[PDB]
């Protein structure tokens, strides 16, 4: 039972070959199904879970209505197998929340939960399961972190976590964690920035973080820093957007970019240096279709020229959040960290006649060998029996 | 592989950050979960489990009429990890109960589960699940026990139980376990105090139980004893009072609070010195909503002044039973016993207009970092399709 | 990991405290519980679970229909732990089966399924679930075994299985099974006996079996063997008869008793010297009722009397087959072999107006402790919605 | 934790005895069972796994509409322990597929599951869960694999794949893979030769496939090959012909028999020299009934003449497809590779009038003690409620 080192290379990819598909709006229907939003996968040195945010209710169940709403006393953080159904018969319970992260640092798993009032949430922390620590609203306006998996490197675990406006500037705050515990945090200096939902990942003993910016920015901000928390910030310069909304592609900004800069979606991306992997939604204003870009110039430059394009979801189909995990040499026996990513198909209110909200997930996997595009979508048939 | 040794002392603490939360009668009205009332958390070194009376039925099923019956043939205690629902998929069955305690020694489970007529039942002690020990009803009056964790101490767990009246004078009795053997006991002399449903925790070696009077107190009793069985007797003597129903706040008593004395509900607390932290009901008069109360001096004073007070359930959500629980160093690394505790949120009858009763849990511990109140309710929609 | 010795004296005992309640039927009106008849528990040196014959069907659904139906291709023989309810989502799969036997060496688990056709079954024997052994009808008349545990002395475990007429006379063999493998049988010379579904239990290193005479028989006849199968024969000889139906008790036979002998249920008695543990129905006549009472003469005597009577079931309550199942010191740390019995409670056809027919079951074990009578019936309320 | 040798010769068998059933589509009239087809068994050093590929449904719900469909995306490879049904509450995610293999090779599980378009389908590999390699189609035209179990010696695995039309020539080829890691494969040069679905199994360090011919051949192909994959092929040249459809027993061919040639079904046999076990169906014309056969020559030999038929499932009852298993001497203990079967038992669409199709299974091993012939059929009855 060892730490995981985390200072190897990202493994570099040339496309990517599909991992997972759990189904679970389809299977719902008729299965006991947890209503979830807000799912995401990360590993440990053996296996590779699920996590989401559950609204306290079963799909096709009355107690699914509302289900839209962000934020109750209900939502918990819970994870299974990766690819399986969130069911209460399969899931094990990690915390009370309406914003988490977790990440396996190679002997335990710490997770991170945010509950109670928007006026002061606390994020409460455990590792193995043990509460280790909390961290409370220190702007007293809807504390918020990750809903992905936080990065771990030589035994220190970190994350992001944003207080304040998410239509204006807000207070965006690192954490260095180890076994549970918060031994360092900074707050980033980012005048004009807005920083949420930040997808991080390690990459030769450092964290590289790409977020969302919901107030003025259709590219998407980055962070970046070491295991003492020395950071430097941007914006994804390309001009092949990455948020939702957002506008055509076209000449892009290392600062943010305010056509359709209002809003956004969680998302990631894979930085090879002065290139990137980028994923997105295939449709520039709503939550449609999903796609893999390669822009080998794209992290530093404007142009909106790219290489490779490796459709995910039909820009017919719904998608939603996504997030980046990686897969650590301690668990594949690669020389690299592999990049992996994962999509949340998001079905229901607003855009469907439901009384309810919830999602489905697929996930892929870096490779270098061959791999297709396609489109592998939610799939279920709405409106259901109860609504 | 080792006994909990259960010498360190209770860890002081300044708030309670939220620890789980299952959701059972929301997602019952749909998945197949256990009606169930009187629920509890114990450890052991390795995990921490939800116990539990079922009604040997589901909810929304017409075998839940009728189940605000305490007592029948078909109540089990059974056990799942903390924060899952109870389901029939995710239990493991303990014994055969409508009473019950159960607590781990480090090395394996001691269950304690009392099924039987009411003028003769008897308690069935097992140790890793294989019958151990039996104790029968010395007054042949509803011989009931904890409905909480038992302590654990070097290798010896101690709980409290109670046989004759709930509206008078009673007999409790002390007892020493090893290995689920009864290896003693001892009649607490106790005339003019009423102790039931013991909530039982060790702190430096010793035993400390605050309970229920159902008798003729509005505040809390409460008895401690060493290894040996050698105790203290008392009543908590804030003017905070613990129990419910009870009066309006006011100069309390070292003895048994007359007012509003009569029935009452399972509670606890944690003893610091003179100071007590209390957690109890928000109304006087019914089983609805919950909070902590840090009163520096509330063990030994009778004034009706405190320092913290702590919001866990809204006035106007339901409550019910609540308990402590410990975390012991053998499973947190710390060198102290850490606090937690349970609330039961109960639904149904007498209160609701509906054919079953039925209960969920929150759970919390005691942490020194910073905490927020809020409320944490049951959330179900009532009343289902079956009632 | 070590082969259970055997070797120990069957534990004496003055009462039998409630091990395990499964609630299937009152559970499977809503939940997805197996339709099962014939369980029996079986232990190892780590656990004890619950054998039982599946219909291939789930409670309240159209496929339980005609279930009173003894043999179909559809049975099969699965388990799960003990106490809990059968179901698809926590039972492991044994073999094909519409009569079984199973018990555990100490290493690893032996199951013997019997399917086919009437006129020609098989008997599968597996050894860590995998197939190690058959045995084909010898007599082309129902090969049939045990329904309920296997015995094992020393690494070889015994059984008893029949071929030919319910209602005459049939043919009877021994078994002697070494790590799934039959090692060694022999034909009962027993004219003017009828055996089947025989409860069999180790004690000195020998074996005692109770068993069902369905020919003409109201008392149950019992062989007993050494591991070189070198048996003896013969009947319980108590005025307290055992089998259902029976007549009232009177001067009974160490023969087969004449009156009422026809037909019969599955049962079980513990032998301890000339003293016997009867367990048996309550209703000469129906499948009611159960009670365990204490004969001190009745293995060699033929008067009715008798010492100790405890209540198990009311005779207003339905009960079924019942068998015995020991817990071996290697369990339980005990310097005896520890006996327990568990009884099927069977609801639905022929006595009640349904379309199905299914059991839930119950267990108690010896103890020397306090103990006391109740009823712990099925408690369904039928007929279900799919009546 | 050993890879398995494989250089032992496979077990003479005399009969098959039933190994498993699950009943799944019976318990799915109520139950949450997956919408499943192309179901086979695998083994490791310590279990055997039924794998299948569901429709991303479950039975009984509106999502199962349609699901006489081959591809889609929502179709996912997982797998549950043999015996069971293929639940969400009991089932392991292994990949996103609507063509797969899987085998242990004694250290780990190599999974390969066939998703994308027709035109463009890739395999992703795994080697304990974790991505291993890719490979993508060769002919654009539907790359299909076996849909049974791939074979391991010494630390290397097999299979054989095919890409090209299903009514013609079409191109196949052989695949060596170590740990998840293809190291060699080589295309059989088969002109007039047809192979899809092979069913292969090692003996004596070497390994066979009997697979399906659909462009032109009743009778089945077949393909050897060392570890080299230096091979041989040819076709069972047995007159008892193998596939379905196929013409009425006759003299047969040792090349492609052109009669009722056209379509198919996949089907295994196991060679003993120049004896064949063959396992069919019962019907010429559609997939009903199925039979084993043990022909002493029938592997070279011409003539319809055979010493052994065992029924299986009866004539009147819906069959499908069929496939081998092993267990190895590191599962078993005996000194050679034991040989097991399955067989698919298809209902509903197209032969019923549903709107969904699904299988259950049925599973045997061989042995040389006494077996019987019978009939164990799906069981279910059509149409369910939501035809
Ligand atoms: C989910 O919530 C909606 C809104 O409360 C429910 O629809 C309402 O039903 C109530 C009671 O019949 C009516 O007073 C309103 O007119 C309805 N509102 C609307 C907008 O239609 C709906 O019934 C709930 N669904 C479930 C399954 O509980
Ligand atoms: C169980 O089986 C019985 C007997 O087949 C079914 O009752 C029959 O229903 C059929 C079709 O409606 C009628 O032809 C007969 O008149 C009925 N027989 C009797 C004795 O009532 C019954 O419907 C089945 N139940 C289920 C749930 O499938
Ligand atoms: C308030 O909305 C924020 C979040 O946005 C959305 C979304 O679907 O866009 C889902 C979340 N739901 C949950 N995490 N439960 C949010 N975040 C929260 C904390 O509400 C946003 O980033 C602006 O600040
Ligand atoms: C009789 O009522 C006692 C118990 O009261 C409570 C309650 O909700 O107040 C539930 C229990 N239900 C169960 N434990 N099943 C009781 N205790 C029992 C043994 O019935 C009380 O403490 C008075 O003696
Ligand atoms: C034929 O009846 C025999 C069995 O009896 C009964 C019963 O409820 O009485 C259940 C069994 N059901 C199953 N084991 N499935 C039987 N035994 C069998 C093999 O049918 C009897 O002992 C006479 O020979
Ligand atoms: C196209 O049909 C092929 C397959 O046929 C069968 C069938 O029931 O006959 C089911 C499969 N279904 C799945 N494996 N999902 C097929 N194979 C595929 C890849 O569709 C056939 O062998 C001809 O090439
Ligand atoms: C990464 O960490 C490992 C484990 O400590 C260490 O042995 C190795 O030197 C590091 N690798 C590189 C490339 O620095
Ligand atoms: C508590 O028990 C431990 C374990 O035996 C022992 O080593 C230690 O001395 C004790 N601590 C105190 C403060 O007495
Ligand atoms: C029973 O078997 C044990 C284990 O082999 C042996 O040591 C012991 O002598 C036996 N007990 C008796 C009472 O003979
Ligand atoms: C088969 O493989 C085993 C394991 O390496 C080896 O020891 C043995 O010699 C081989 N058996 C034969 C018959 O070659
Ligand atoms: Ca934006
Ligand atoms: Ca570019
Ligand atoms: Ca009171
Ligand atoms: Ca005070
Ligand atoms: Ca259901
Ligand atoms: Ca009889
Ligand atoms: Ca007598
Ligand atoms: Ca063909
Ligand atoms: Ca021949």
Known sequence: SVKLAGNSSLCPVSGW???????SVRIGSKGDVFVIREPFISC???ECRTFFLTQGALLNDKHSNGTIKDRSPYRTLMSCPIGEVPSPYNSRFESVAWSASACHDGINWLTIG???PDNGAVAVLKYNGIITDTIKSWRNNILRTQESECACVNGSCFTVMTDGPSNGQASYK???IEKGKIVKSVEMNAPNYHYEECSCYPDSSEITCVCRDNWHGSNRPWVSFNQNLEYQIGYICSGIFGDNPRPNDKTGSCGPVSSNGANGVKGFSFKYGNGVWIGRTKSISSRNGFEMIWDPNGWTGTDNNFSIKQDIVG???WS???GSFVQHPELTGLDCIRPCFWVELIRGRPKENTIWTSGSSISFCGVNSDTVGWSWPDGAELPFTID
């Open 17 to 23: 070959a599909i991992y997972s598909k759990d189904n």
């Open 44 to 46: 440990s040195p053996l």
């Open 315 to 317: 820009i017919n189909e």
């Open 320 to 322: 939603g959040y996504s």
């Open 114 to 116: 945010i509950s109670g």
């Open 174 to 176: 690192i954490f260095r």
